[PDB]
Write a protein that binds this DNA or RNA. Structure first.
Ligand SMILES: [Mg+2]
Ligand SMILES: [Mg+2]
Ligand SMILES: [Mg+2]
Ligand SMILES: [Mg+2]
Ligand SMILES: [Mg+2]
Ligand SMILES: [Mg+2]
Ligand SMILES: [Mg+2]
Ligand SMILES: [Mg+2]
Ligand SMILES: [Mg+2]
Ligand SMILES: [Mg+2]
Ligand SMILES: [Mg+2]
Ligand SMILES: [Mg+2]
Ligand SMILES: [Mg+2]
Ligand SMILES: [Mg+2]
Ligand SMILES: [Mg+2]
Ligand SMILES: [Mg+2]
Ligand SMILES: [Mg+2]
Ligand SMILES: [Mg+2]
Ligand SMILES: [Mg+2]
Ligand SMILES: [Mg+2]
Ligand SMILES: [Mg+2]
Ligand SMILES: [Mg+2]
Ligand SMILES: [Mg+2]
Ligand SMILES: [Mg+2]
Ligand SMILES: [Mg+2]
Ligand SMILES: [Mg+2]
Ligand SMILES: [Mg+2]
Ligand SMILES: [Mg+2]
Ligand SMILES: [Mg+2]
Ligand SMILES: [Mg+2]
Ligand SMILES: [Mg+2]
Ligand SMILES: [Mg+2]
Ligand SMILES: [Mg+2]
Ligand SMILES: [Mg+2]
Ligand SMILES: [Mg+2]
Ligand SMILES: [Mg+2]
Ligand SMILES: [Mg+2]
Ligand SMILES: [Mg+2]
Ligand SMILES: [Mg+2]
Ligand SMILES: [Mg+2]
Ligand SMILES: [Mg+2]
Ligand SMILES: [Mg+2]
Ligand SMILES: [Mg+2]
Ligand SMILES: [Mg+2]
Ligand SMILES: [Mg+2]
Ligand SMILES: [Mg+2]
Ligand SMILES: [Mg+2]
Ligand SMILES: [Mg+2]
Ligand SMILES: [Mg+2]
Ligand SMILES: [Mg+2]
Lengths: 51, 203, 99, 193, 148
RNA sequence: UUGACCUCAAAUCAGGUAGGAGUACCCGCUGAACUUAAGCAUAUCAAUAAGCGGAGGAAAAGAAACCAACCGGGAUUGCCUUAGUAACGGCGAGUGAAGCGGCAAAAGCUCAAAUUUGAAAUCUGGUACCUUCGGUGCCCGAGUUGUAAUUUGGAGAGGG
RNA sequence: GUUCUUUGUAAAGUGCCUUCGAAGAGUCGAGUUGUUUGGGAAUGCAGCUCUAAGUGGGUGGUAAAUUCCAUCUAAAGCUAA
RNA sequence: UUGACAUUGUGAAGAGACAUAGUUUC
């Protein structure tokens, strides 16, 4: 009966994922994180719906 | 029919005809064994309103049980503990004398199933009961959509578990504010109200 | 009734166009019936009075209805049953040893 | 064992409580299980919905009586008025409650209407076997939602007849309060020899 | 987490921050609320005056609900109308067509008078009012209509 | 003399059934003290441990002698909540539930008490056959001190 | 889904009129003792003594007398989730 | 150990009351 899971306010959860999405633009972050995007066409990288 | 007559007559236990009857019968029983087969209900109107039927695979046993308090056993009255528990002698027992009645004939006829039971008499030493029983492997019973429930295993020794009418009574099984303690059955609801319920996401 | 339509006072509560339900027969679990009247009548005269009933109708004839009630209250459950028992005992008296 | 300026607490942990700790680790499992149960029952239950037409009903007590809410079942009078018997009603996915009573016409009609709508929006396949497969609408609750009845209009004329609300309350409180005492005076002054 | 905790920091000292003289022992002043009228009284009076003894009448089998009656002050009151509609009523403040506010429908049992509503007329439906709430509501040309 | 009945017996009589085990969970019985109260007896630990009888795959509970006091709800069970609250309590230490509301799941019913009386209409068993979890014929038997159909309070029954 | 027997001078549902309308006892309830409960002039359970009625009975969380009101229908019984 | 109540029924004589017919109690 140790606490295993953790409550996080839903809205704070969203703030976080919103921030996280915003950062998937911003090449230097993507670079800093590992990730070999030093020669992708552009960022955000968007691709055909055909995928 | 005559059963309505028998019913009303039976409520006049102070009446001259009935105390003659009470007095002769109660001597006769006391002469017989403490548990004995009864040939036929002696209150046929009572038996049949508790589920009895004059077909084969229905049985009546008459049984006798001592009256009075449960004297707490214990050598010489010694309790070995706190004062609140030093009683020995005004101690009363939570089951009815009729439960004892049932349970003893029930052990005497383990091939049978106790269906129900009723009071017939008493003196100062004993209460006397007739117990009505059903044979769950009699084909007469095993057929019979009305009684073959009693054939399921869930109903073994109902008398030993508090499931006859006497037992549900003493167990306190009744709806309402007066039965909060004892109703979903008391050990179980205690356990309920003393369980710590923790959620993954603590409430 | 009819409720007043406000939130305190005598017939407090919301007004509602109202209906009154068909009676439930349970609700008549008390009632007589020719059969029970007859059978109870008959058994009574088969088996006659009982000891406390016998002391009761003496008490009445010889000591009044108030001292009968007091004793009958002790004998039975309580006071409302004592009222009934004496009443009944009174009618044994009337009907029988009178007219 | 008492110190500092702290609230007095009441932590009932003086019995062998560690023997009755239920941790719901099986929250996810149960949910899944419960979901599978419903999928299963839906399938077994052919095109029938998973639930029964429940009636409208006004909730008990001063606190919730403002709101209206699903009841157990319809009442012999309701069923009758919607033109059916209860034995049949029971087989046609409708809930029937011999215990409930109608004292209230607005609720009675609401309910009868419900039964009309229900009957019109179902189809009852023939007894035989034929089975013209018809696609199951899972709920019935969702299909026939209980709504809260409109009790007025948004704007309207101001009728101020003059006599204050507060004092009507106080007086009404008052009348009640002295009702018995005035009755004793009525009685006692009636026994004017 | 344990990593941020003084007991990691006490490792190596002898007494774990509990002192050499006084020690850390099981239940020095007794357990729980022990001592209340005796060796813990100074703390109990001060911090908890009121604690021992009785006041007032017992009430057997009290059912809160009986007494359910939330308050709303004039303070708010216009809050019980959604804003789009609010401005429409605020301007064109009038008889003939004034807003009906059902304060029971909003879940309130009593209207009270904290302070100042605009001069606009309201029709206020409620179970109870405070003499002031009504006075004020009326001086704007509204009324209270008593419901249940 | 013969033949019943009632009650009571006996059989290596025909066929069956109980025991013991397991026992996490379940239905009951019986029943502590350590402990807490800074001592201690009421209280607490606890309607707990140990002891005893009895079940299942769940058990128990269950179609209201309920809850309410409302515009009333509506079998039972469980979860969230009511609430560390009403209340109990050397009113000390301590203890402590329920009604409403939301949700999981949903399901409802049968006896007794009734003249079939123009027909005991009911049933165990043996037996022969058969299409064998059973059916039919026949025969002993049960049963009127009442076995079927009909009725269960929501009703419902007899007449028209 | 198919297919074969029609069970039947069988069974059931519904509307109006009339008369009926059986409904559980050493129980309910009461005193007292004891135990238990949050349950307090007594929450349940049990022993002993008393022991009902039928427009009755139970309950309505402060004892009692009176008068009403509300609500169920006990002392028998089965039942999946 | 002592009392009351229940187990507990039947006669007869004598006391005891509606207040010198016998229901009732010792
Ligand atoms: Mg036999
Ligand atoms: Mg001991
Ligand atoms: Mg004690
Ligand atoms: Mg089963
Ligand atoms: Mg409790
Ligand atoms: Mg937390
Ligand atoms: Mg706890
Ligand atoms: Mg402890
Ligand atoms: Mg677990
Ligand atoms: Mg559902
Ligand atoms: Mg088909
Ligand atoms: Mg921490
Ligand atoms: Mg760490
Ligand atoms: Mg560190
Ligand atoms: Mg340091
Ligand atoms: Mg340092
Ligand atoms: Mg260090
Ligand atoms: Mg240091
Ligand atoms: Mg320190
Ligand atoms: Mg040290
Ligand atoms: Mg205190
Ligand atoms: Mg405010
Ligand atoms: Mg043999
Ligand atoms: Mg065994
Ligand atoms: Mg104990
Ligand atoms: Mg310990
Ligand atoms: Mg101590
Ligand atoms: Mg100590
Ligand atoms: Mg000590
Ligand atoms: Mg205790
Ligand atoms: Mg044990
Ligand atoms: Mg098994
Ligand atoms: Mg299950
Ligand atoms: Mg079961
Ligand atoms: Mg019923
Ligand atoms: Mg109601
Ligand atoms: Mg319910
Ligand atoms: Mg004190
Ligand atoms: Mg405290
Ligand atoms: Mg306790
Ligand atoms: Mg609900
Ligand atoms: Mg069923
Ligand atoms: Mg009944
Ligand atoms: Mg005990
Ligand atoms: Mg008690
Ligand atoms: Mg009273
Ligand atoms: Mg039965
Ligand atoms: Mg059951
Ligand atoms: Mg003597
Ligand atoms: Mg004897």
């Amino acid at each position: 009966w140790r606490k295993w899971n953790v409550k996080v306010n839903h809205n704070e959860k969203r703030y976080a994922t919103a921030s996280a999405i915003a950062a998937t633009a911003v090449a230097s972050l993507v670079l800093a994180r590992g990730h070999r995007v030093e020669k992708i066409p552009e960022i955000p990288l968007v691709v055909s719906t055909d995928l | 029919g005559a059963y309505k007559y028998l019913e009303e007559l039976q409520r006049k236990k102070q009446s001259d005809v009935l105390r003659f009857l009470q007095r002769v019968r109660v001597w006769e029983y006391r002469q017989k064994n403490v548990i004995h087969r009864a040939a036929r209900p002696t209150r046929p109107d009572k038996a049949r309103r508790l589920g009895y039927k004059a077909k084969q695979g229905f049985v009546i046993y008459r049984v006798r049980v001592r009256r009075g308090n449960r004297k707490r056993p214990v050598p010489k009255g010694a309790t070995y503990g706190k004062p609140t528990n030093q009683g020995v002698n005004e101690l009363k027992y939570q089951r009815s004398l009729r439960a004892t009645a049932e349970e003893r004939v029930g052990r005497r006829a383990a091939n049978l199933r106790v269906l129900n039971s009723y009071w017939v008499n008493q003196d100062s030493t004993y209460k006397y009961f007739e117990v009505i029983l059903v044979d769950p492997q009699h084909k007469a019973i095993r057929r019979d959509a009305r009684y073959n429930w009693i054939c399921d295993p869930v109903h073994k020794h109902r008398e030993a578990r508090g499931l006859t009418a006497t037992g549900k009574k003493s167990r306190g099984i009744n709806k309402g504010h007066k039965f909060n303690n004892t109703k979903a059955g008391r050990r179980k609801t205690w356990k309920r109200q003393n369980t710590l319920s923790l959620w993954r996401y603590r409430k | 009734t009819v409720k007043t339509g406000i939130a305190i006072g005598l017939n407090k509560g919301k007004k509602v166009t109202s209906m009154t339900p068909a009676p439930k027969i349970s609700y008549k679990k008390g009632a007589a019936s020719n059969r029970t009247k007859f059978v109870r009548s008959l058994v009574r005269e088969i088996a006659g009075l009982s000891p406390y009933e016998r002391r009761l109708i003496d008490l009445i004839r010889n000591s009044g209805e108030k001292r009968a009630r007091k004793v009958a209250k002790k004998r039975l459950g309580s006071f409302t049953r004592a009222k009934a028992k004496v009443e009944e005992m009174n009618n044994i008296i009337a009907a029988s040893r009178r007219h | 064992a008492i110190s500092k300026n702290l609230p007095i607490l009441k932590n009932h942990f003086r019995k062998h409580w560690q023997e009755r700790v239920k941790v719901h680790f099986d929250q996810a499992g149960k949910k899944v299980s419960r979901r599978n149960a419903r999928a299963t029952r839906a399938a077994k239950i052919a095109p029938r919905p998973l639930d029964l037409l429940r009636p409208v009903v006004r909730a008990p007590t001063v606190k919730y009586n403002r709101k209206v809410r699903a009841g157990r079942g319809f009442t012999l009078a309701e069923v009758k008025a919607a033109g059916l018997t209860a034995a049949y009603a029971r087989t046609i996915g409708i809930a029937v409650d011999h215990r409930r009573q109608n004292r209230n016409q607005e609720i009675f009609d609401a309910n009868v209407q419900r039964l009309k709508e229900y009957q019109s929006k179902i189809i009852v396949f023939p007894r035989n076997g034929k089975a013209p497969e018809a696609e199951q609408v899972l709920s019935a609750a969702a299909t026939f939602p209980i709504a809260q009845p409109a009790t007025d209009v948004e704007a309207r004329a101001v009728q101020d007849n003059g006599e204050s609300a507060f004092r009507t309350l106080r007086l009404a409180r008052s009348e009640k309060k002295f009702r018995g005492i005035r009755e004793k005076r009525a009685r006692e002054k009636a026994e004017a020899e | 987490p344990s990593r941020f905790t003084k007991t990691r920091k006490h490792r190596g000292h002898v007494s774990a921050g509990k002192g050499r003289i006084g020690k850390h022992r099981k239940h020095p002043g007794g357990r729980g609320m022990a001592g209340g009228q005796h060796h813990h009284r100074i703390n109990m009076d001060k911090y908890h005056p009121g604690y021992f003894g009785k006041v007032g009448m017992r009430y057997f089998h009290k059912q809160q609900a009986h007494f359910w009656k939330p308050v709303l002050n004039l303070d708010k009151l216009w809050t019980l109308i959604p804003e789009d509609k609010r401005d429409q009523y605020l301007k064109s403040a009038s008889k003939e067509t004034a807003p009906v506010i059902d304060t029971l429908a909003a879940g309130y049992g009593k209207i009270l008078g904290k302070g100042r509503i605009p001069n606009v007329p309201v029709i206020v439906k409620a179970r109870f009012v405070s003499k002031l709430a009504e006075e004020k509501i009326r001086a704007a040309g509204g009324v209270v209509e008593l419901i249940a």
